[PDB]
Structures are given as structure tokens and as C-alpha cells.
Amino acid sequence: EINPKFKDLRAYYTKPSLEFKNEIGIILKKWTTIRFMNVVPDYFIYKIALVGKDDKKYGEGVHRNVDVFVVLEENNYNLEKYSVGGITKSNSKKVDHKAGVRITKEDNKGTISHDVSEFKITKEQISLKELDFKLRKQLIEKNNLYGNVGSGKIVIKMKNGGKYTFELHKKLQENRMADVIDGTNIDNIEVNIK
Ligand SMILES: [Cl-]
Known about the structure:
The PDB classes it as sugar binding protein. Keywords: Oligonucleotide/oligosaccharide binding fold, beta grasp fold. The protein has a 6-stranded mixed β-sheet, with no helix packed on it. It has helices spanning 7-12, 54-57, 128-143, and strands spanning 18-27, 36-39, 46-49, 61-70, 82-84, 87-89, 97-106, 112-121, 125-127, 152-158, 163-167, 180-182, 186-193. It has 3 helices and 13 strands. By secondary structure, it is mainly β. It folds into 2 domains: 1-14 and 91-194, Ubiquitin-like (UB roll), CATH 3.10.20; 15-90, CATH 2.40.50.110. Chloride ion binds next to strand 2.
């Protein structure tokens, strides 16, 4: 049932995630090829890589009203607690929003199945990192993504008419992990797997 072709992707997207909300981030002096936002929600200092749009977005010093979606990863910076992107502005109000998920899957035998879920949204502003990670994990667990088949796309359709796309044959690009969208404006999610 489990094609070893998809081993790396299935491994990555079954990693545990952590969520730190209403926190502060501290950015110190640059000391390598990239900068980090430090978050300290427990006895650890989490080093959050500033990639893509985040590098210009957050200057040296203190940033308040930060939420981070964390997936701890191994890294080349010799850091114990490291994660990439996933930084968003904390809520300014309760958010209780639901977006329908429609899943079309075609296996190696050409069998076409359809499935549905509901993606619960509790955040005003949500990172692509979080949408991409939670949705793939769910598809692995419920729809056998990266089992029999491991290609296709997730598409997040915005109420404002726009859309964002995640190709399932590759890990989400690290620069896009820092991209953020308006959670309240997600309309529906379309997933096609083959
Ligand atoms: Cl640092």
C-alpha cells in the first residue's frame, strides 16, 4: 500500500507540528546566511528562519502579537529548535470559520474517488506553511496521499476571487512558507490527487 517513491514526502508531512500563539519574537544581530526570529514559549528558544517576504518584513528587535506555526526540522545551522516561516499576526477577534474541502483522487489503476471534508479556520491571518502542512497530513491520514499515489495539487480558493496552489509532487517551496493570507477570506479548498 506504501510506494517507497514517496518516502521523503510522506515522512515530512507526518512530522508533528507545534503552535505558539499571542507570543513575542526577538530578532538579534545577523550571524549567518539568514536571520531568525527567536520565540520563547517554554524552556526552549525556538529559532524561526526568516525566509521569503519575512526577511524585509521583520527588522532587528522586538515584535509583539506574533503567532508561529512550527514544524521542527533538522538543519545546517547546528540549531536544536528550528523551523521555517509560519509567522503570522495574532488574532484581534474570535474567528470561527469553516471552508469545504473537495478531494478527487485517481489511483494507478485509474479508479476515480471523491471525498469531502471541512477545514476549520480559527485564525485571522494564516500562513501558507500551515495550510499546506495540515492539509497534506490530513490527506496522508484519510486519503492515502503518498501511499499508492503522490502527485496533483491543493488549491485554496479565496472569497475575493483569488487562489493559491500547492503541487503535491514536491515539498512546499521554503520562501512560500512565509507567505500569509486572510483566513477569514478562504472560501473552499480543491484537492486533486493522481
Ligand atoms: Cl539568533
